[PDB]
Every structure is written in C-alpha cells, then in structure tokens.
Design a protein around this ligand. Structure first.
Ligand code: HEM
Ligand code: HEM
Ligand SMILES: [K+]
Ligand SMILES: [K+]
Lengths: 249, 249
C-alpha cells in the first residue's frame, strides 16, 4: 500500500553518493549498531491511529533530548552531522534511514530496499512510545502492533536487530553484547536467546518474552535454524519500519 | 457544526439532579474556581489536527498526575468523587464539564449551555499542551488557536475565567487572586488588568499579553466597559471549550 514520491535526479544522485560515504564512515567508525538503533528508534515513534511520529528527521544535532535510557542518540547524530552537511539536498529523515540501511549492510546483513522522499517535519513525537526492556509480549504487541502497525512476524525479526551491538550501564543500565560477534549481522541473537544465559552475554526481559509466546517462539526457532529465512523476514520488517507514515501509512 | 448524541431519559434525569447537587456542593465548599479550572484544563488538552485529548474523563481520582504547576487537580477530583458516585450513569467527562458550568453559574456568571453525551475514553492526552503563564500572545494563539481551534475573541473572553479564584505559591508558584471579589463572576478581571498592578492582586504575564496585542486589547477594553458583552462572549467560548472533540470537533 505504498506510493513512493518522485525525487529529482540530483536527489537520487545524492542518495547514491551518501550511501557509499555512509558505508565507509560506519565501517571505519565501528558504529553500525548505534546507527541502526538511531534509524529504528526514529522510525519507531510512529502511531498509526494519529499518524504522528515516524522517521521524519525530528531527532537531530544537537539532540534534543531529554529522552533517557537512551542516551547515545546524541552521539549518533553528532557523528553523522559532518557527513550530512556534504548532502544538503537530502532530508535528515532520509539520511538517517539510509544510515540504518547501510548499518545492516556493512555488517553483512540483508540489503534492505530504500526509497527516498521523506520530508523533515517541524515537531518531534511525544515520548513514552518506545518499548520498555523490562516488559513482555503484551507490551511488545502494544508498541509494534497497536501503535506502529507491524505484524507478530515483524516483531520477532526486528528484535534480531540486537544481533549487533551492546547495552551500556551508563545508558539504559543493561550491559554488554547479545552476541559473541556484535559487529556481524547474523542469526546469533536467536541462538544465544534459546541457549539461555551465558557469561559475557546480555538478554533483556523483552528478548526473553519472545521465548514464552506461542506465536513468537516458533519464529525464534525458525530464525535460529535458518539464517536465510531470518534475513528475508528481517529485510521486510526493517523496510516497513523505515517507511512508517511515509508514502502511505 | 455540532450534532449532539441522544442520551436516555434516565441519563437526562441524572444530569438535572447532578446539576442541582453540584450547585449546593460547590457553593458550600467554596470551590467554584478550582472546579472551573478542572473543567477548563480537562477540555483544554484537545488538539484539533490529531483529534486527541479534550474533555473525555481522562483526569480522575486518584490523579494521575504527575502534571505540575498545576497541583490542585488531584484535590478537585477527590472532592467530586463522592458526588459522582451518586450518579454512576453519568460519564466522568460529562460530570466534570457540568461541574465547570455550575461553577460559573453559582458565582453569578452566565448560564453556559450544556449538552450531555461525552464518553469516557481510555488514554489521557500527552503533556505540554497547557498554556505557559510566563509566555505571551503568540503562545496563547498556538495553544488556544492552533491546537484547540478557538478564536481570538474566545481567548480573551476565556482569560476572564480568572475573575474567580487565585494562584498559590505551592502550586504554580504565582500567588493570590486576580480580583477583590474572587468568588464573584464578573468583569473585574479586565478592570484590574487595565489599571495595572495593585497590592494584593495577581497578574500573570499571560494576562498582561492581552494588553499589548492589537486584536486582544480592544476586547479587553470592551469587556471592562460592558459586563453584559463579556458574559455573552464568555458563555459562547466556554461552551465551545467544553465541547472540543465532542459531537464534532
Ligand atoms: C523490541 C523492543 C526493543 C527494546 C525493549 C529495545 C531496548 C534496547 C536497549 C535497552 C538497548 C541498550 C541501549 C544501551 O544501553 O546502550 C538497545 C540497544 C540496541 N537496539 Fe534495541 N530495543 C528494541 C528493539 C530494537 C529494534 C527493533 C532494533 C533495530 C531493528 C533495535 C536495535 C538496537 C541496536 C542495534 C542496539 C545496540 C546499540 C549499541 O550498540 O550502542 N532494537 N535496545
Ligand atoms: C490563557 C492561558 C491560561 C494560563 C496561562 C493559566 C494559568 C493559570 C495559573 C498559573 C493558575 C494558578 C494555579 C495555582 O497556582 O493555583 C491558574 C488558575 C486558575 N485558572 Fe487559569 N490559565 C489560563 C486559562 C484559563 C482558562 C481558559 C480558564 C477557565 C475559563 C482558567 C481558569 C482558572 C481558574 C478559575 C483559576 C483559579 C484556581 C483556584 O482558585 O484554585 N484559566 N491559571
Ligand atoms: K552477531
Ligand atoms: K471577580
């Protein structure tokens, strides 16, 4: 149900050049997880009923923010600002979603389709829309399903975004990587989740909730057994997330 | 542009009986200003663009709240709770707006028309929608005009709600009554505003802003000279406020 806007050839050229620059920058700076989180969090403020929030450039340097546990988003936007300045024609909204797409790609993840044309709108979303790491399956459905409009499949696949990166005690309070290879986009998140707690590795209560739900659990099993299937569902879910409220939502 | 819902005869009977009970209670308890503020603040959270917030029972005992400077709303709902319990058929939304209407009437104000049928909806509005007493004319238009959808005339007339009551240093931080007769609904708010500061009396920066605006100021002058005209415009504005998002907004 999407109808993507037309952008100029010059806009399209800037998207391609920015995509390359983002690859090199993100790879060199080792900041893929931070960038994926920035993109996903920006997009995740969308509420379908009111059609407010979503990936529309509302988070930017200097952030903003406020918003806690969390923290780190401020660093991400500052890191990207010099690069963004090289592409004044691009909206911040597009730039940050493209960074998220690139973050998945340069860590070896699937190639998430990207369509340009998001407009930067004046007011940021209200707070309290982000998921709470201490809560469970009902809460996940409230946030990703009732508010964002994503499916149960999307919830499990997107949770696999935790396959890269780590929590920090000075940010959320949780601490450490979900995986033994936290710069490699793979299905290890699901394998580690299944095998229970392991020293050095993190599981949020929100991750564990996937294990006890009769719909989520079989997907966790599927993804743990089949990385190709995880990649396919992940790319579909990330694309939908990145396009919430855009070109029809 | 209103189409009021049908309510049962029993509902209508409860409205009439509650209205009488509210008169006696509010008069005896000397809480008209607190009740007017409760009604007006509840209604004032409405945002026309998203059709969220408004007078829909979202503030209630035990409050809730949070929301500061402010404070006092908690007292108001607790005060009304035993009376509300005598009218289980009425929505809290209707009950609180009726209390606001009665508050104006028992202090000698105009008779604001009341239509029943507001439904109590699950989620409270987001915060930050209430007006800031330290700000000026542009801010008032942002809040009452852009968000609520009220006119410049409505803004000045409704500001006259300050003709009853007082600020408290432990609540907002401001202190004292706007008028020498703070339980009498009259046009004294405008007279005191015009005459400048007087010992014992309060003026918020938001009140003073009415004086410097080329649209607001002539209305302040008009209301100060003609209480009948103030009453007419006030009743119109209070009715609109009390019905935001209801029966079409
Ligand atoms: C399902 C609900 C989710 C919850 C409760 C949640 C919560 C969290 C928390 C608490 C952190 C730690 C932040 C810190 O301390 O630095 C974090 C980090 C992260 N999140 Fe999630 N998140 C969720 C969904 C997602 C989604 C859908 C994605 C992307 C598809 C994502 C991507 C990431 C990444 C990559 C990190 C690592 C950040 C870094 O390494 O600095 N998360 N998340
Ligand atoms: C125009 C923007 C407005 C601002 C900035 C504002 C601000 C305030 C503040 C700071 C207080 C003092 C609270 C305390 O310390 O106890 C107050 C009280 C009050 N407000 Fe307003 N208000 C506004 C509009 C209105 C409207 C539209 C109404 C009703 C029609 C209203 C009715 C009242 C009443 C009756 C009180 C006295 C409360 C008491 O005596 O406890 N106000 N307001
Ligand atoms: K990994
Ligand atoms: K008065």
């Amino acid at each position: 149900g999407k109808s993507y806007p037309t952008v100029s050839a010059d806009y399209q050229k800037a998207v391609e050049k920015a995509k390359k620059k983002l690859r090199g920058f993100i790879a060199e700076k080792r900041c893929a997880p931070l960038m994926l989180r920035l993109a996903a969090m920006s997009a995740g403020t969308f509420d379908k009923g009111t059609k407010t929030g979503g990936p529309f450039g509302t988070i930017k340097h200097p952030a903003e923010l406020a918003h806690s546990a969390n923290n780190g988003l401020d660093i991400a936007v500052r890191l990207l600002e010099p690069l963004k300045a090289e592409f004044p024609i691009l909206s911040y909204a597009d730039f940050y979603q493209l960074a998220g797409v690139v973050a998945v790609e340069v860590t070896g993840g699937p190639e998430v389709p990207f369509h340009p044309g998001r407009e930067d709108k004046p007011e940021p979303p209200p707070e309290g829309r982000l998921p709470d790491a201490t809560k469970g399956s009902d809460h996940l459905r409230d946030v990703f399903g009732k508010a964002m409009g994503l499916t149960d499949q999307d919830i499990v696949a997107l949770s696999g975004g935790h396959t890269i990166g780590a929590a920090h005690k000075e940010r959320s309070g949780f601490e450490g990587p979900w995986t033994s290879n936290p710069l490699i986009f793979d299905n290890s998140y699901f394998t580690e989740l299944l095998s229970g707690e392991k020293e050095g590795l993190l599981q949020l209560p929100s991750d564990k909730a996937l294990l006890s739900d009769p719909v989520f659990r079989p997907l966790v099993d599927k993804y743990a057994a089949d990385e190709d299937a995880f990649f396919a569902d992940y790319a579909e879910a990330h694309q939908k997330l990145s396009e919430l409220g855009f070109a029809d939502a």
